[PDB]
Design an enzyme around this catalytic site. Structure first.
Site, PDB file in Angstrom:
ATOM      1  N   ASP A  37      -2.975  -0.884  -9.951  1.00 55.16           N
ATOM      2  CA  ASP A  37      -2.124  -2.012 -10.303  1.00 55.16           C
ATOM      3  C   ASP A  37      -2.655  -2.874 -11.447  1.00 55.16           C
ATOM      4  O   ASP A  37      -1.951  -3.788 -11.884  1.00 55.16           O
ATOM      5  CB  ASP A  37      -1.886  -2.870  -9.039  1.00 55.16           C
ATOM      6  N   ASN A  51      -7.119   1.239  -6.482  1.00 54.00           N
ATOM      7  CA  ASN A  51      -5.851   0.668  -6.904  1.00 54.00           C
ATOM      8  C   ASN A  51      -5.515   1.013  -8.341  1.00 54.00           C
ATOM      9  O   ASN A  51      -6.391   1.142  -9.205  1.00 54.00           O
ATOM     10  CB  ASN A  51      -5.851  -0.858  -6.750  1.00 54.00           C
ATOM     11  N   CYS A  95      -8.599 -10.268   3.665  1.00 54.80           N
ATOM     12  CA  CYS A  95      -9.642 -10.144   2.646  1.00 54.80           C
ATOM     13  C   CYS A  95      -9.844 -11.440   1.877  1.00 54.80           C
ATOM     14  O   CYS A  95     -10.985 -11.805   1.564  1.00 54.80           O
ATOM     15  CB  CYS A  95      -9.321  -9.015   1.672  1.00 54.80           C
ATOM     16  N   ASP A 116       0.848  -1.196   0.000  1.00 52.36           N
ATOM     17  CA  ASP A 116       0.000   0.000   0.000  1.00 52.36           C
ATOM     18  C   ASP A 116       0.886   1.248   0.000  1.00 52.36           C
ATOM     19  O   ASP A 116       1.337   1.697   1.048  1.00 52.36           O
ATOM     20  CB  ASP A 116      -0.943  -0.053   1.204  1.00 52.36           C
TER      21      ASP A 116
HETATM   22  C1  LIG Z   1      -0.136   9.466  -1.951  1.00 57.60           C
HETATM   23  O1  LIG Z   1      -1.438   9.532  -2.504  1.00 57.60           O
HETATM   24  C2  LIG Z   1      -1.609  10.660  -3.328  1.00 57.60           C
HETATM   25  C3  LIG Z   1      -2.957  10.562  -3.995  1.00 57.60           C
HETATM   26  N1  LIG Z   1      -2.977   9.526  -5.025  1.00 57.60           N
HETATM   27  C4  LIG Z   1      -2.503   9.585  -6.282  1.00 57.60           C
HETATM   28  C5  LIG Z   1      -2.786   8.366  -6.825  1.00 57.60           C
HETATM   29  C6  LIG Z   1      -2.496   7.829  -8.187  1.00 57.60           C
HETATM   30  O2  LIG Z   1      -1.277   7.098  -8.088  1.00 57.60           O
HETATM   31  C7  LIG Z   1      -0.095   7.793  -8.196  1.00 57.60           C
HETATM   32  C8  LIG Z   1      -0.020   9.073  -8.719  1.00 57.60           C
HETATM   33  C9  LIG Z   1       1.215   9.697  -8.785  1.00 57.60           C
HETATM   34  C10 LIG Z   1       2.358   9.052  -8.336  1.00 57.60           C
HETATM   35  C11 LIG Z   1       2.287   7.771  -7.811  1.00 57.60           C
HETATM   36  C12 LIG Z   1       3.526   7.065  -7.301  1.00 57.60           C
HETATM   37  C13 LIG Z   1       3.664   5.632  -7.723  1.00 57.60           C
HETATM   38  C14 LIG Z   1       4.210   5.197  -8.892  1.00 57.60           C
HETATM   39  N2  LIG Z   1       4.202   3.836  -9.124  1.00 57.60           N
HETATM   40  C15 LIG Z   1       3.642   3.221  -8.116  1.00 57.60           C
HETATM   41  N3  LIG Z   1       3.443   1.851  -8.169  1.00 57.60           N
HETATM   42  C16 LIG Z   1       2.900   1.082  -7.174  1.00 57.60           C
HETATM   43  O3  LIG Z   1       2.616   1.519  -6.062  1.00 57.60           O
HETATM   44  C17 LIG Z   1       2.746  -0.389  -7.517  1.00 57.60           C
HETATM   45  S1  LIG Z   1       1.352  -0.833  -8.623  1.00 57.60           S
HETATM   46  C18 LIG Z   1       2.068  -0.607 -10.205  1.00 57.60           C
HETATM   47  N4  LIG Z   1       1.426  -1.214 -11.202  1.00 57.60           N
HETATM   48  C19 LIG Z   1       1.991  -1.098 -12.412  1.00 57.60           C
HETATM   49  C20 LIG Z   1       1.293  -1.784 -13.548  1.00 57.60           C
HETATM   50  C21 LIG Z   1       3.165  -0.386 -12.589  1.00 57.60           C
HETATM   51  C22 LIG Z   1       3.749   0.209 -11.485  1.00 57.60           C
HETATM   52  C23 LIG Z   1       5.002   1.028 -11.592  1.00 57.60           C
HETATM   53  N5  LIG Z   1       3.199   0.102 -10.265  1.00 57.60           N
HETATM   54  S2  LIG Z   1       3.095   4.262  -6.826  1.00 57.60           S
HETATM   55  C24 LIG Z   1       1.046   7.144  -7.745  1.00 57.60           C
HETATM   56  N6  LIG Z   1      -3.415   7.621  -5.882  1.00 57.60           N
HETATM   57  N7  LIG Z   1      -3.533   8.329  -4.781  1.00 57.60           N
END
Ligand SMILES: COCCn1cc(COc2cccc(Cc3cnc(NC(=O)CSc4nc(C)cc(C)n4)s3)c2)nn1
Ligand SMILES: [Cl-]
Ligand SMILES: [Zn+2]
Length: 296
Positions: free
Chosen positions: A115, A113, A264, A40
């Site tokens: 992912d 999510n 879950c 998470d």
């Molecule tokens: C703190 O909250 C702020 C509010 N906010 C924003 C959002 C939307 O998301 C993000 C928006 C901007 C930046 C990030 C940083 C991340 C980059 N990459 C991440 N990856 C995971 O964590 C694993 S899943 C996965 N799956 C695939 C297919 C590929 C990859 C690389 N990862 S995190 C997330 N959601 N909430």
């Protein structure tokens, strides 16, 4: 005069197999993907903020902000490579929603999510409201272009450490995840206004219901709609410090909210077993897991 004959998982399962329960909305969050090996990233206890180092961010939250991304995209894409899951194997909880879809019970799955595991498990874009966006598609950020790119293209750029640029116009290409400073997908509010007129059961799985827009969806349910929480911890109750629509699991006035506290996957398994779906769910998970494991 309540719809559940008792405030337990058994009560929910009897309700689901009654004529009264035809349309299920699932609200799911990071807790349905931790058992797939995806931490998470919104949890401070995960340690995302101490991981940020050489990136001279004007503030640690800059890596989530759209305007910073557009001027300095390299930190984001380095973090994406570091966080990229090693495999995409949806959980029992994801395939339980595919069963709901197969049986014509799934009205919608709202997910926090990014992912893509809901899609891998067989939910289609029509079935999904990705409240924080998704890595599944990416787009050129130029308003006059907006060329779409699939995850395979984005993955290749991320791993090769080449900042993704549009082949038509050479602007940046950004995963369709919602950065800070980006507006929520308009489909979120459209679907919310329509879906909650039609829902018979709210299934809440793997979310603490603390972060918007999820922190307000459970209050959109009709007053009679049962709400089942399958989660490690109780969530969604009114916060006593901020003075409704909150979860009431345990008071003498409780009438429709049920909390199943545990993993879950084990809760969804328990529900499927009550429904007579355990063999169907095991057969589906084992087949899809075998298919994913055999990818060559
Ligand atoms: C703190 O909250 C702020 C509010 N906010 C924003 C959002 C939307 O998301 C993000 C928006 C901007 C930046 C990030 C940083 C991340 C980059 N990459 C991440 N990856 C995971 O964590 C694993 S899943 C996965 N799956 C695939 C297919 C590929 C990859 C690389 N990862 S995190 C997330 N959601 N909430
Ligand atoms: Cl949350
Ligand atoms: Zn372009």
């Amino acid at each position: 005069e309540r719809l559940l004959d008792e405030l337990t998982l058994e009560g929910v399962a009897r309700y689901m197999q009654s004529e009264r329960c035809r349309r299920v909305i699932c609200l799911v969050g990071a807790g349905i993907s931790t058992s797939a090996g995806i931490p998470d990233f919104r949890s401070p206890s995960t340690g995302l903020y101490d991981n940020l180092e050489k990136y001279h961010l004007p503030y640690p939250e800059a890596i989530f902000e759209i305007s910073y991304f557009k001027k300095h995209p390299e930190p984001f894409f380095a973090l994406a490579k570091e966080l990229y899951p090693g495999q995409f194997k949806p959980t029992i909880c994801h395939y339980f929603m595919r069963l709901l879809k197969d049986k014509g019970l799934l009205l919608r799955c709202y997910t926090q999510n990014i992912d893509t595991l809901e899609r891998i498990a067989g939910l289609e874009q029509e079935d999904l409201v990705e409240a924080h966006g998704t890595f599944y598609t990416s787009h050129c950020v130029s308003a006059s272009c907006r060329h779409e790119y699939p995850l395979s293209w984005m993955k290749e750029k991320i791993f090769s450490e080449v900042t993704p640029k549009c082949e038509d116009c050479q602007s940046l290409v950004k995963p369709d995840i919602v950065f800070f400073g980006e507006s929520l997908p308009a489909r979120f509010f459209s679907c919310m206004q329509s879906d909650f007129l039609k829902v018979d059961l709210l299934l809440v799985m793997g979310t603490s219901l603390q972060v918007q827009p999820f922190a307000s969806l459970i209050s959109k349910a009709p007053l009679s709609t049962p709400r089942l929480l399958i989660n490690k911890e109780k969530a969604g109750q009114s916060d006593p410090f901020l003075g409704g629509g909150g979860m009431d699991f345990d008071s003498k006035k409780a009438y429709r909210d049920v909390a199943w506290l545990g993993e879950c996957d084990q809760g969804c398994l328990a529900l499927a077993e009550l429904l007579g779906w355990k063999k169907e769910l095991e057969d589906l998970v084992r087949r899809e897991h075998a298919s994913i494991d055999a990818q060559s």
